[PDB]
Amino acid sequence: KTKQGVAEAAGKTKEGVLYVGSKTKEGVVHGVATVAEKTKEQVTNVGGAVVTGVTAVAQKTVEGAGSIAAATGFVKKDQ
């Protein structure tokens, strides 16, 4: 018996109005806003990596070892 990340709700009544609710959020990206106004961007790239935009990554994994959620704007030359 083991509980992990469990939302539990219980209610009891006889007469009237009863409301029961449960919510669970795991690995959730919520509410990302970006505004660019009159922005000047000049990029010169020679064999590299340049990142300018908006990146939103949400990952949920079970029994996963060595997982990478996001890898943005990198140069890898492993031998």
Among 50, 51, 62, 70, binds ligand A1BGB (CB under 6 A): 70
Residue nearest to ligand A1BGB according to CB distances in the complex: 65
72 annotated to a ligand binding site:
no
Structure tokens at 1: 């018996």
Q: Which is nearer to ligand A1BGB, 21 or 47 (CB)?
A: 47
What separation in angstroms does the CA of 69 have from each of 11, 21, 35, 50, 57?
38, 30, 25, 19, 7
User: Alpha carbon 37 to chain centroid distance?
Assistant: 26
Q: Report if residue 60 touches ligand A1BGB, rule: CB under 6 A.
A: no
What residues form the annotated binding site for Cu cation?
30
